[PDB]
């Protein structure tokens, strides 16, 4: 009778962007389409509402850039690109 | 049906200050149950697990 599943419905974790497919071309439109198809709506019934919409995607950075890996790794990548040797061997060292 | 059974029911479900001075993790929800007077059927609160 008093089914909790019908009373305690709340958005799941990572809800706003979970369905976003991994792509770089048009992530927001692609994510929007994925949400629409995931929700069970078919394009033939949504009509004109499906053409211009866009939704948040994981491929888009908070700054508004196309990202292909977690931002920490991007930070790690640039950091690792610059690591001069701590101790070097040269004849004139005192 | 028997006075003994009722006594235990009180001794279990309706003693409140008992067993106070110890760590107690078994905190339940607010509503334990309801009883409908017109039919006498008792409804237990669902437990989410």
UniProtKB/Swiss-Prot annotation, chain A:
Residues 16-39 have a biased composition (Low complexity). It comes from the Viruses. It is found in: Virion. Residues 1-68 are annotated as: Disordered. Belongs to the turreted BTV-fold inner capsid family. Homodecamer; each decamer is made up of two conformers of VP2, called VP2A and VP2B. 12 homodecamers assemble to form an icosahedral capsid. Interacts with VP6. Inner capsid protein that self-assembles to form an icosahedral capsid with a T=2 symmetry, which consists of 120 copies of VP2, with channels at each of its five-fold vertices. This capsid constitutes the innermost concentric layer of the viral mature particle. This is Inner capsid protein VP3. It comes from Aquareovirus C (isolate Golden shiner/USA/GSRV/1977). The chain holds residues 13 to 106 of 1214 of the full protein.
Swiss-Prot record, chain B:
It is found in: Virion. It comes from the Viruses. Inner capsid protein that self-assembles to form an icosahedral capsid with a T=2 symmetry, which consists of 120 copies of VP2, with channels at each of its five-fold vertices. This capsid constitutes the innermost concentric layer of the viral mature particle. Belongs to the turreted BTV-fold inner capsid family. Homodecamer; each decamer is made up of two conformers of VP2, called VP2A and VP2B. 12 homodecamers assemble to form an icosahedral capsid. Interacts with VP6. This is Inner capsid protein VP3. It comes from Aquareovirus C (isolate Golden shiner/USA/GSRV/1977) (AQRV-C). The gene is S3. The chain holds residues 127 to 175 of 1214 of the full protein.
């Amino acid at each position: 009778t008093a089914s909790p599943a019908d009373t305690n419905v709340v958005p799941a974790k990572d809800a706003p962007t979970t369905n976003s497919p991994p792509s770089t071309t048009s992530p927001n439109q692609a994510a929007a389409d994925a949400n629409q198809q995931q929700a069970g709506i078919v394009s033939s019934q949504s009509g004109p509402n499906a053409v211009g919409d866009s939704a948040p995607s994981t491929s888009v950075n908070n700054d508004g850039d196309i990202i292909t890996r977690p931002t920490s790794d991007s930070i790690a990548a640039v950091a690792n690109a610059t690591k001069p040797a701590a101790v070097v061997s040269d004849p004139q060292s005192m | 049906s028997t006075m003994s059974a009722l006594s235990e029911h009180l001794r279990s479900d309706h003693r409140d200050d008992a067993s106070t001075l110890l760590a107690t993790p078994m905190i339940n929800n607010a509503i334990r149950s309801f009883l409908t007077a017109w039919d006498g059927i008792r409804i237990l609160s669902p437990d989410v697990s």
